[PDB]
Symmetry: D2
Subunit: 240 residues, 4 copies
Amino acid sequence: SRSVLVTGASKGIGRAIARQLAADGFNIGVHYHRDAAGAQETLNAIVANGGNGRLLSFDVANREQCREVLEHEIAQHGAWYGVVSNAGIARDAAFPALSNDDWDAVIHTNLDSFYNVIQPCIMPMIGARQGGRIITLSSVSGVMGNRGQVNYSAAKAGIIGATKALAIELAKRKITVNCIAPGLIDTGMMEESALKEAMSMIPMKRMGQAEEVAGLASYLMSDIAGYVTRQVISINGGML
Amino acid sequence: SRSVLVTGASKGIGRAIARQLAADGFNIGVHYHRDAAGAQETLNAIVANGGNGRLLSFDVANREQCREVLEHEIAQHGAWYGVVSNAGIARDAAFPALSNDDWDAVIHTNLDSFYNVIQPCIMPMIGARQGGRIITLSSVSGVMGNRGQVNYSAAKAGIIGATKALAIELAKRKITVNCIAPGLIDTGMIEMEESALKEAMSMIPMKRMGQAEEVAGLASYLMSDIAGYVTRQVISINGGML
Amino acid sequence: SRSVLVTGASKGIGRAIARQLAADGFNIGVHYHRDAAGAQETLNAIVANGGNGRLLSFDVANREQCREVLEHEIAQHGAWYGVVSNAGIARDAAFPALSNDDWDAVIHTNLDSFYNVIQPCIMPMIGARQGGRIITLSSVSGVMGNRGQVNYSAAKAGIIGATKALAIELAKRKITVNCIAPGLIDTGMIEMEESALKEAMSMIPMKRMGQAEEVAGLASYLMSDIAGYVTRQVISINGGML
Amino acid sequence: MSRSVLVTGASKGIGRAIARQLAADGFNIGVHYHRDAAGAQETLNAIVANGGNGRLLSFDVANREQCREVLEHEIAQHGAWYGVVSNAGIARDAAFPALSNDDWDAVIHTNLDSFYNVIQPCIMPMIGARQGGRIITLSSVSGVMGNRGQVNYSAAKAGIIGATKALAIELAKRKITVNCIAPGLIDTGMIEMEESALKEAMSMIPMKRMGQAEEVAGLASYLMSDIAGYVTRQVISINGGML
Ligand SMILES: NC(=O)c1ccc[n+]([C@@H]2O[C@H](COP(=O)([O-])OP(=O)(O)OC[C@H]3O[C@@H](n4cnc5c(N)ncnc54)[C@H](OP(=O)(O)O)[C@@H]3O)[C@@H](O)[C@H]2O)c1
Ligand SMILES: NC(=O)c1ccc[n+]([C@@H]2O[C@H](COP(=O)([O-])OP(=O)(O)OC[C@H]3O[C@@H](n4cnc5c(N)ncnc54)[C@H](OP(=O)(O)O)[C@@H]3O)[C@@H](O)[C@H]2O)c1
Ligand SMILES: NC(=O)c1ccc[n+]([C@@H]2O[C@H](COP(=O)([O-])OP(=O)(O)OC[C@H]3O[C@@H](n4cnc5c(N)ncnc54)[C@H](OP(=O)(O)O)[C@@H]3O)[C@@H](O)[C@H]2O)c1
Ligand SMILES: NC(=O)c1ccc[n+]([C@@H]2O[C@H](COP(=O)([O-])OP(=O)(O)OC[C@H]3O[C@@H](n4cnc5c(N)ncnc54)[C@H](OP(=O)(O)O)[C@@H]3O)[C@@H](O)[C@H]2O)c1
């Protein structure tokens, strides 16, 4: 039984990833920040479909809380086989109007979470000797940049760099490290004007669904994907 | 029943792709150039595992033959749902030593095959209105270049450009078009001394070659219904080379 | 002192590159295919500004003619220090409507020219021991793909792959090999209706076409002595398109 | 119009070389330093001795308030910068599981937060001056491809690339270009390697040598020039063919 931590599994892409990986047979750490009810709904659906998992909670910007909860989880249940670092936020504004909090909240939550969430999981993953899987969530904005989102583009591009560097370090230990960069996905995470501009750049002329992102995570998590590492794979309807 | 043409299915990556997609439930056009016995072995294994397929043959450098065989196949059996353009060759030498035939054979076979194989399949795929899948095989040398292979790097990079452009054209028709760029994969194509193999391994963080089956797993994902929003991509399966 | 061959120097980007590099002090091989008058105009402007150069001609799709002319030029004048492989064409159509000639003319002219033009220049460039510069012209379509241009995207992406591979081979010999990928540049190559131009502009953050002279400024940088550590790169000059 | 260019980390290495080259090109240089005042003065002395102009200034790029205060004062006193070269950076290497809190935070705060801290105060004035402008950031090959033992540095430097691209799109209509230079291995004080480690690094560089600071400065000079007005949103790598 291999366990997979999915951050932000209370809704959207994280929920869809949690459901799919549970169906694949992984035991899921259904993580949430504040939306306990949403996480329980995710878990209920996992269980009702014959899968297994459990709830856990932490703020990915809170380093100490991440370390404490994760060390406790690992002591009680053993090392994670997989870690899907999905939780993220956006705080959009034109660059010259971006507040201190807009910048810091996005960098601290989206980028520092790489260190806060993943670092406590690594030595135990290595210690278990089953190999492993690390999957991060970036964004097309991290690959190409996006107007009104200098902070988000920075954080999400930073995730890509972290992911690539860690891939090289862990390659000999049979742990793959990859990044999924979704384009525009239909979730709770913008104006009609902005949506139109986004659509015009999407050859498929539609948003992706959370379940489609989950299908890619399912592939990367599978045993047959063991030679895929250090990659950013974009699921974006042909945007780039 | 959706059919998938797999070029170069008589050995190596093409064989592995053929087997995997057959197991996924696709009816396979098991293509070969000259290795009929190899293609039959691929098909026998497909059938023995409860799948379906048929043999067909053409030179991917021979435009007229490709059109003739493919039009006949489509008239007799209906449009392909998927096309995996896998057939390829290498003719390595230092750039100043590369012969006319070294350059032309690699460009004509690897790059012109995009047009020769894929063009006859497109209007029928559109006409069938089931959407579709096009998967091309490039290489890490097409992404980053490789010494002693200016011809192969050129052809393989050209496949990437063709793939991306066609992706944009076919997006509204629910046909995805993607490229797989393997790194070093353990097949009959690769013939290296121990010294050369060590040099190659030093650039691969995983310190091993890929297996044909691993490349087939990625083709299987791209072929699946859940991958309908993935298009215009080059996905590299290379043990972390880049 | 140091000579630079600029293919397609009779108009557009090649002319602008020829003029700029001549102003930088390079002796220019002002190449043309059929537009002798245009090449002479380029040369007259070079000379009038205190620079030097000479006319030469060949079809970059004609391998034998390229070798013959270039071997003669090199025997008579010595090795080129730089080669700017700029000549190119487009033959646009939707992929299923692309004729045999549309595909072949674009691949043969744009991609085979890498081999036909550059190969005869390499051993002499090495033999001269002055180091060197090779600059190819690709396109944003070669980086990202472009609808209605599967052939051009393929050829231009192939140029990138060739360029990267040759860069690795020549690095120890102090010859840099790089690719310039312009976006939309205001030359005779571009023929768009007002409607099509607006669609193109909407994807360009700078909301204007580039000028040939801007592309020439980048070539001037890559040709300069201070750029000796830049190799294996595709540099895009495209107003922020990507 | 004498055009001024701020060069962070101009007291040594790449920043010094950029400062010298852009001064020779005719730009008035803000020769920035953090703690190495003597080094910055030597950069400025060489600028002046060669017939150029510039002035010293100082701030910690991790200190947001100090950056805003100094830069607003500089802009009030001398007018808007035409160019900003965000060059200052550090490395704090260790294997990912051994990386300390300070190793991670110092690299992210200094290398990535500096984009916001240094560049934001310069933008509205640059726009207000109506001369267009140039923003050049310094990333690294490790930001493009990742590098073992540097998950923090790779993250920060890749983050700079993303910030650079996004800002390029915002400022394109205002004739301010925004680009990133990603050097490979450059011979400065930042690099401290044993002979063994140097050999391993060289094996990945087709040119089999380190770059020189002056070479990086040549690329900055091109991007700063008027003829480079259509080049924006790019990461240009100067790395001897590494990638
Ligand atoms: N949607 C898109 O179009 C899109 C595009 C590109 C990339 N992405 C990336 O994909 C990931 C998920 O996106 P999504 O649209 O599914 O997000 P979403 O629906 O907005 O959900 C965000 C999730 O992250 C959690 N979260 C937010 N702040 C947190 C914090 N400080 N600590 C811990 N968890 C926190 C939330 O938990 P609670 O509800 O419990 O607070 C929630 O489950 C993000 O990294 C995002 O940047 C999304
Ligand atoms: N192996 C690697 O390391 C590697 C790495 C990156 C990319 N690739 C690419 O992956 C693809 C498959 O490679 P592989 O190693 O599986 O090759 P392989 O084992 O050598 O198989 C080559 C296949 O291509 C077919 N073929 C060759 N010339 C042909 C022609 N003119 N017309 C039609 N078919 C032709 C062959 O048919 P017959 O045997 O019937 O003659 C054979 O089935 C190629 O495109 C290759 O460039 C391979
Ligand atoms: N304009 C753009 O927006 C744009 C964008 C991206 C890339 N590019 C690339 O930039 C390069 C130059 O483009 P341009 O816009 O300056 O084109 P142009 O104005 O159409 O000039 C084309 C040049 O190519 C030469 N040429 C054409 N066919 C040839 C052949 N078979 N053999 C030898 N020479 C041949 C022509 O010679 P004659 O005049 O003697 O016939 C001419 O000098 C091309 O490689 C093109 O693909 C252009
Ligand atoms: N050298 C390489 O191989 C290489 C490769 C890729 C990228 N880079 C990048 O190139 C840039 C310059 O590198 P370099 O090798 O020239 O570095 P260097 O010789 O270490 O010089 C570093 C400069 O950064 C300044 N600095 C450091 N921390 C600072 C802070 N908190 N606030 C303000 N300024 C600070 C220093 O100021 P004081 O001296 O006054 O303290 C110094 O002038 C960096 O961003 C680096 O990451 C270097």
